[PDB]
Design goal:
This is part of a larger assembly, with two copies of chain A, one copy of chain B, one copy of chain C and one copy of chain D.
Chain A: H1 29-36
Chain B: H1 3-19, E1 23-27, H2 30-41, E2 45-52, E3 71-77, E4 79-80, E5 83-84, E6 89-91, E7 100-101, H3 103-110, E8 126-131, E9 134-137, H4 138-143, E10 148-154
Chain D: E1 6-15, E2 18-29, E3 34-45, E4 56-58
Antiparallel strand pairs in D: 1-2, 1-4, 2-3
Classes of the chains: A mainly alpha, B alpha+beta, C mainly alpha, D mainly beta.
PDB class: ribosome
Keywords: Ribonucleoprotein complex, Mitochondria Biogenesis, ribosome
Entry title: Yeast mitochondrial small subunit assembly intermediate (State 2)
């Protein structure tokens, strides 16, 4: 009963709604640009360095 | 930015209020100067002055590394209706436990809701917050939509 | 002197130019007097926040730069413009705390601040009558001791009194003070006029009729309420002061130049108030 | 993205192509009511064996 | 199925546009406070103040 306060006081659960499109579409320019953008270099980034 | 020094300053101001001295001196640093200015704007302090360890500056003195060790900020305390205007000065975010609140939690704290065991803001009280190395009152930090470290209580 | 004239003409560009010129080319930064003149500049431009910041710096920089009674009187004037009486009382208490000796201007400024604050319930925080009484008390405190007088202060004093009379709706006191001021001013100017009295009537009368005094008298008329009891009546000192002013007004009327005040000590009805407002206007 | 942790090398040369990296993370403990650092050591691949003890790296 | 796919794609693009509008409006809101502040600091007597210190 307590935890329901987080979820709008609704008791019970619905199954998680499924996404019709599992992967992003090619018309989403922003997602492609973020994907294609140069990866941040170094440790605050996400990728292996040039020499390593 | 030493919270230890802010705690020491708070205790010093409380002790000065107890013995009812009209003037007192605190360390001359950016954090202490901003904190004293915020107290003065609210009317808790009578006057701010820059001076040496011996007293206020008779003539304007530029601050340099040569004399930084001997610089002090002299604050004039207020005692009205046989009561100290600045009675109690305490810390919320302590060195052992530092409390950084997002803006919505800061509003909740101002709105009578206890957040992270901090007593809610009282009517005639002032809570100071640090955001981006700037000291302000909680109301301003909420109006600026700035998440910040909740430092001290002055009632 | 440069900043003084620049304030008198209220030219921001001249103030800025003179300050920048002195700093850059002569190595002179404003002292206590120049900073006070800058505060008066900010007051003239209705720039209260900048004036308060300059006052804070005056305290901050050094003891030589620390404000004295003149700067505190300027801040009291700023509070009067703001109608901010808690700050006025706080500044008076600070003046006492820092051992600065008040002056006549200080008491007159405090009385005027309280009179202005007592205009409405909203600005006075519902304490209008008490604020007017406190202003009268400040005037009495001035009466007690000589302090340092200034040639203009006397004029200011009377304005303060009329303010306390005007915001109280004290039509009897307002009428008496207005008649006293107009009579004394015309008598003094006629006594000390090089030109012949008859020819220069226009100039003398123009100088006599101060617009602010008329404005205060009309304000006293506008705040008329028959059930109102003057705040100054409660005190024994206040009632004696009222008796003195009213007696002098009556005696002067009984005793050239004439004003259209009705031959009655006080107005007890609305029609007479309208008649006197039209007559004086 | 692939999980990324900033760390300090605390052991190297003990094993072939493997190092120990000291990862600190921010956690909130309710019983204390405090944000404190929680520490762990990960066994990490070092191909080329470039990293040395005391170096500051990712894993 | 065709209708569902096409409407889903249009819905995603519409959310992207909505977020663009939101962010742009916030940036012009920052421009607004830029306009407001210069009014206050157009009153520069170029003396040094304590709040500026």
């Amino acid at each position: 009963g307590k935890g329901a306060a987080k979820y709008g006081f609704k008791s019970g659960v619905f199954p998680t709604t499924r996404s019709i499109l599992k992967s992003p579409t090619t018309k989403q320019t922003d997602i492609i640009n973020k994907v294609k953008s140069p990866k941040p270099k170094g440790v605050l980034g996400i990728g292996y360095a040039k020499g390593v | 930015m030493s919270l230890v020094k802010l705690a020491n300053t708070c205790a010093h101001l409380q002790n000065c209020s107890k013995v009812r001295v009209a003037l007192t001196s605190i360390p001359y640093t950016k954090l202490q100067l901003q904190f004293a200015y915020n107290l003065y704007q609210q009317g808790f302090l009578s006057s701010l002055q820059k001076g040496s360890t011996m007293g206020p500056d008779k003539d304007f003195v530029e601050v340099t590394p040569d004399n930084i060790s001997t610089r002090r900020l002299w604050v004039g305390l207020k005692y009205r209706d046989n009561k100290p205007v600045l009675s109690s000065c305490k810390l919320i975010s302590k060195p052992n436990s530092r409390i950084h609140l997002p803006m919505e939690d800061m509003k909740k704290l101002c709105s009578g809701v206890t957040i992270r065991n901090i007593k809610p803001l009282q009517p005639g009280e002032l809570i100071l917050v640090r955001a981006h190395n700037n000291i302000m009152d909680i109301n301003e930090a909420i109006s600026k939509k700035l998440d910040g470290e909740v430092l001290c209580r002055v009632k | 002197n440069c900043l003084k004239y620049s304030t008198k003409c209220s030219s921001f560009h001249d103030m800025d130019y003179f300050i920048t010129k002195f700093r850059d080319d002569y190595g002179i930064t404003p002292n206590k007097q120049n900073l006070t003149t800058v505060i008066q500049f900010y007051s003239r431009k209705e720039m209260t926040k900048q004036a308060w910041n300059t006052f804070d710096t005056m305290k901050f920089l050094s003891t030589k730069h620390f404000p004295d009674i003149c700067t505190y009187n300027t801040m009291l004037r700023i509070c009067e413009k703001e109608r901010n009486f808690p700050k006025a009382l706080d500044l008076f208490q600070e003046i006492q705390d820092h051992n600065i000796k008040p002056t006549t201007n200080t008491y007159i400024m405090m009385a005027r601040v309280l009179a202005s604050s007592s205009s409405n319930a909203v600005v006075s925080e519902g304490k209008s009558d008490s604020l007017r009484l406190l202003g009268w008390k400040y005037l009495h405190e001035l009466e007690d001791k000589n302090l340092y007088r200034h040639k203009k202060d006397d004029l200011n004093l009377f304005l303060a009194m009329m303010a306390l009379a005007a915001f109280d709706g004290d039509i009897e006191l307002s009428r008496a003070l207005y008649y006293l001021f107009i009579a004394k001013k015309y008598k003094t100017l006629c006594a000390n006029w090089k030109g012949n009295i008859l020819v220069d009537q226009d100039t003398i009368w123009k100088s006599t009729l101060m617009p602010e005094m008329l404005n205060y008298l009309m304000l006293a008329y506008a705040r008329f309420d028959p059930r109102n009891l003057p705040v100054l009546s409660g005190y024994e000192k206040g009632i004696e002061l009222r008796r003195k002013f009213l007696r002098e007004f009556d005696s002067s009327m009984r005793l050239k130049f004439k004003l259209p005040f009705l031959p009655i000590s006080d107005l007890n009805s609305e029609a007479q108030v309208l008649a006197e407002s039209n007559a004086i206007w | 993205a692939r999980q990324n942790f900033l760390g300090l090398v605390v052991s190297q040369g003990k094993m072939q192509k493997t190092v120990k990296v000291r990862v600190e993370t921010k956690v909130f403990n309710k019983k204390i009511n405090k944000e404190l650092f929680h520490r762990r050591d990960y066994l990490v691949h070092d191909e080329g064996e470039i990293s040395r003890e005391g170096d500051l790296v990712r894993i | 199925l065709i209708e569902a796919f096409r409407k889903e794609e249009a819905r995603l693009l519409h959310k992207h546009e909505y977020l663009q509008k939101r962010t742009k409006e916030l940036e012009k809101a920052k421009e607004l406070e830029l306009e407001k502040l210069n009014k206050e600091k157009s009153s520069d007597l170029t003396i040094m103040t304590l709040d500026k210190m």
